[model samples]
Target chain A: GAEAAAAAAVTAELRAFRAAGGTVELEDLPVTPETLARAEAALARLESVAVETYTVPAPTPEAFLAALEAALARLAAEGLPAILLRVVDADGNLVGSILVAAAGPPAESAAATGRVLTIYVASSPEGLKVARGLAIETRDAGGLALAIGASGAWALAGLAGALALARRLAEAHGAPVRVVTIGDPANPTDAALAAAIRAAYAAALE
Target chain B: GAEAAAAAAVTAELRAFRAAGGTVELEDLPVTPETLARAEAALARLESVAVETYTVPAPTPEAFLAALEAALARLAAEGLPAILLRVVDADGNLVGSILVAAAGPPAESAAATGRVLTIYVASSPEGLKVARGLAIETRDAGGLALAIGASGAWALAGLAGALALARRLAEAHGAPVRVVTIGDPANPTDAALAAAIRAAYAAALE
Candidate 1:
């Protein structure tokens, strides 16, 4: 399945990219009208994409921008780059929020990784896409190894989806990707999720 | 003329009711499915009943409720009945909001009054009919005056249209209607405004 293939691809990419010391940038992929149209068309085909969006109370626009700046400042102090993604309805109402940050590479591997410091969404699919998009965007912006930590069922799904998306993106760019999450077996992530990731990863490894 | 007519009706009704020592409730009706439908139907006819919409930066259910509650609280405190009109697009995003407060004698007045807050629309014949129906509803509900607090320049014209509507309603009810505003004079309201109110009042005075 797409999920397994994505996961395996991420794991393999992360390992190889580390050895090669290479990266990708999303900004370089100029989004043209045709590309936007294609993306829009693709989105249209995903008919069930509309889900009951969940939301939490957020600060006013001015307050939110201030909070984001503060978070960025804290990240800078730690010698890390971070991005704050704020989603709003077409009317500019803040409906969803997520922040991506670099969590220094694993103690053993000298890999630069990322972590989600804040996230709020209404559904798993929506959250997953958001996480994946941010990760891809970060990687395309010259970052490497996006690490995400999420707790609970919906969040676990988000992490899983993020890992899969990251793996697929790495393969697309001939780079490497890695996703790691350690959770208690008592409330482990969906057992069947890894299957989807493996199917995607196999191609990348090959 | 509409103003004079509305005023005459209010004066006659108030005097007559007072002589009989009757008290009225002057209720501010809550929005129900039926009322909502009626409101839409009326607006459909009155091209003058204008709508202005905008998006706030917070797009959560809680935020929607909070904003509605705040506006209602202020209106209720003024002892005027209010209508919270929500404007939504095809996608169900809240594109606009309006707070309507109908003025008039207390509900349960011995004499039928008029609808207080008549939203502004276009000046087409159909629009005038809707505006008239709105005023009639307020009067039937025992309103003595109509007050609309519009937040934008586009809506300011709508608010001023209520004076003309009040006059029309008074003419129908054989009453007198008055228009009130707290805005500064540096901001002149509209052209052909007082004339419209007079036309309605003149018709009702007879």
Candidate 2:
């Protein structure tokens, strides 16, 4: 009876929190023995793999998939697995595609070596929460966070806000995060971004 | 000097409103003689034309472009004008692609006979505003708003909220709106969706 009352109280608190626009992250939860066990299981999957990317101007999902197939092929050729898929426009802005993560480490590394998760700021309240969640996930998984910045891109303000929030969240608990600019936002090229991913992986090892 | 003061006052109002998380729509502004003149000029461009579409599952920008090129070819073959691109996942969730409208109606109808603007909810604050803007634009042009609803999709709450907001915003002045469900959200088929677009156009005439 006491346990039931406690569960109800917790549920009530959660509903009230959501109603007040409060977002909760895993890190915000109280840690228990079970929580630690789950986190350890999660950490077991934290292996970084080789990174692969395909770029196309004026991207669509069809284009993204073709590129994905190509990227996947390269991964398969090298016996690598994908961890994340990021969609960016010609202008270098990160397109807000719903993200999906591939099986990591066994768990895995990139094009078959270092892979990074890319992020952008979002203006929607939910989007910001998503950005926060992704950053925290990357941190938890021992993966690098790569936030894409493209000024004059769609939802510039939202992207910037989300990007900043992502960086902060990912870096919590001393996690590593990186930034790569596209679309003249920082005048960085694809080669530069690829290099940055490698660099982040290298730095993490240190 | 008085005109400059009026402009500053308006700017102040805009800043204050935005600071409060308020968004403005074209319809929100006072209608003046200048506004009426522009609306009249805009209406002259409101000829709905033959609608054309190409659908593929698990879409990417590259895939979208290929489809677009094919669609455009058909338009060229029959002397049609293209407008609006809608991207959806295999499950019928509207993907948030930065939208660009083809020059509409030199003033025309769709497959060169009916056309629709499709929408999905966004979790980002900016995305919701974008949804609102697109709906208003379609309304201004006398076009139909097609909102895709997919449950068990990415960001379900955000999409639902955005879709409802879009419908309300577009119908601000009695604009037409329709909903298409994919991924068991409403058990509607793609063929049904295509028919709905055609039907929306047919209804506009009456």
Candidate 3:
């Protein structure tokens, strides 16, 4: 009975603390055997209440349309067809075709859906500048995003910038945003980046 | 004078908004020509105020000693030298010798100082769990920290996890935390990772 009451009291305190935007790190807790055990159980229960499951939806025709429309509009404004944008979802599925902004035949579709959303922006300075904003939107929607050079140079600076902005947006919305960068030019398979992306999705869903 | 007043007013509004935790995206702002010009100028000025310059200090004997002490303590407590810790400052200097857990000779020094502090942790799961707390301290002290597998395999998951944590900590501090990942083993010269690390440091200095 006393243990139950003590646990209830601890839970109440934690709930109030979290409600006030407070976080209790493990080190911050009292160092006692009973306290540690109670804290562990309380944390698990708190997580159950505090955590929200987020899923990376499968790429639908609608997802493809959104990418196409954004690409088309950007190209229309830039008045060039020298940019390419590819969308990869969390499962490393290249969900949309390579979006080219040159005056040519429409690029084919290569879109799929999964836990994360990565928008690959390969364009001129102006297109890249524009695409960074769109990439943040993808992140704000609880997705992972990045921008890479089409010419085989991974643009880590651009990727970092988008992530910074995405972090701010996600925090404001109380959503989870994960950023994963694939270092090379292989299809997104069970590589390091792919595994990281999946792990983030799994955590969010859990 | 008119421009000055307009600029000052905009700055005041922005400061007030930001003080209240507000963020302004480009699309969210007014899109008039005059507004655009004013906003652009305001952004330029804001960058000057919001950006803080961080320096990479030269590594000294003191830095090496600190790493050694931490390594010694962690080894004693963890009952195994399963941890590998390396400290790199934003300037990409090898400030301290590499730290390896287990009975071995002293690891070489690769310590440097800069705005970003990267603590490379290599260990088994238990060691990693302990090392992450240390990484957070590095982040809180205004450094970038990462963990890798002591084994040949690079701990990409740990790298991504540290980055995600850095993003959150940096955002909370309202300071910029730049993440640069080096991808190859070129002894830190002309390595893609080396270049990226230097680039981030230079940009931060800028």
Candidate 4:
């Protein structure tokens, strides 16, 4: 019950920060190496669980834009800490990544914030690992307590805890949280994609 | 010599049209089935050329939006016809495609201004083929004589004729064309990308 309450508090604070286009750091968050390690282990188990891959038929350019808007709008209303995108290929190889995190004032010590990090040239498995590892570091080191993806191909690992955080956050914000993916991230230059990515970040900033 | 002159004239007209944000259909001139075939054949040859793939170091999210804007601005000023992006894995398997075409109003029948097209899930070889094919159709049907890419993995197909058109067009317009792919399109849900796509299209419409 206490843990649930903590998660709810984090989510609500995140929502407020996002709405104001500002950032916040929860001092003395019960975050520690043990919790993060357990979360990672929990994520490992969750990845093995069967989850239906979420998908949508490619929409017309016009409809696609609308869908993009709706997804971002929902993310803000729900107070998602962040919306992430991991690029991979047919065989599950990592290609590139984009993450938009909601944070408080920028910290000189933390490396990421409204930033883009790329490890594009690495091989798939290795690249994916690098992308995820870096993302986790950014979240942890940057003092992000809660982050959620609205949609994309990659599922956020550690289902139990991730979903736990997502659920409480969504519940606390009084809105549904949707962490899904749309089309493949094969073409980094696809205009529809470019538009979607830009919008997601802008919404986070907002 | 006459064909070269025709290509030059067509390029000049197209650039003027793009600058004015207008459209055109080159009803007369040297464009013919033979030239189309030659262009296709030339494309085939170019595909085999040992061309160095052009690339730019990936930009962070903030810089990415700026880069996207700069790319489109250059596209307009240089009278470039298109900017292409192709995604692939380490073993060179095609993963995605993004083509930005600068064209006139869709023939009363076709419903799109300058648009972004994606065939992400198609197999590498076929996806690349589809991207080129659609691009050619857009250029030919819409009577665009010259298109240039600032960067990317694949060199423009039909290099000889494509370059032929590109050279004259650049010369007639008095600006060297830069059609390139900058940065990875890894983040599928990137809002900035989406915004950029919409902006590019709007710019074309303008």
Model 3 chain A worst lDDT window (10 residues) = A22-31
lDDT of 2 at B182: 19
Poorest stretch of ten by lDDT in candidate 4 chain B: B23-32
Q: How displaced is residue A177 in candidate 3, in Å? A: 2.9
Best TM-score among the predictions, by candidate number: 3
Badly placed stretches (over 4 Å) of model 3 are: A1-116, A119-147, A150-173, A181-206, B1-100, B103-130, B133-206
lDDT score for residue A99 of model 3: 25
lDDT of 2 at B73: 49
TM-score of each: 0.19, 0.21, 0.23, 0.21
Clashes of 2: 54
lDDT for each residue of candidate 2 in B1-206, tens digit (9 for 90 to 100): 42233223323332333334323211111122333454355435543645443344542223433544454445556654333444555776565332223334312311121332333222233323333344435545544332222212222222233333333333333222222221111112321222222222222222
lDDT per residue, candidate 2, A141-206, as tens digits? 555332222222222222233233333333322222122221111112321222222222222222
* Evaluation by lDDT, superior candidate among 2 and 3: 2
Runs of candidate 1 with Cα error greater than 4 angstroms are A1-99, A103-146, A149-178, B1-206
Residue by residue across B1-206, what tens digits does model 4's lDDT show?
Answer: 42233223333433443454322211101122333454465345323211122232321222222333343445566666555544333556543333434454213113232222111111133223433444455454543322322112122121122323333333333222222111112222222322332333222323
lDDT of 1 by residue, B1-206 (tens): 43333334433433333233222111111122344456556445332333334344422323333444444455546664544455454566754444454443333231453322333322223223333445435544555333333332222233333333333333344333333212110112211222232222222223
Q: Candidate 4, which CAPRI tier?
A: incorrect
Query: Which tens-of-lDDT digit does each residue in A1-206 have in candidate 1?
Result: 43333344444533444334323111101122333454344334322211122222322322333433454455546665444444444466544444444333222122333222212211223223434344434443345333232323323234334433343333433333334221111111311222222222223333
Error of 3 at B39 (Å): 44
> lDDT score of model 2?
0.32
Q: Which docking band does candidate 2 fall into?
A: incorrect
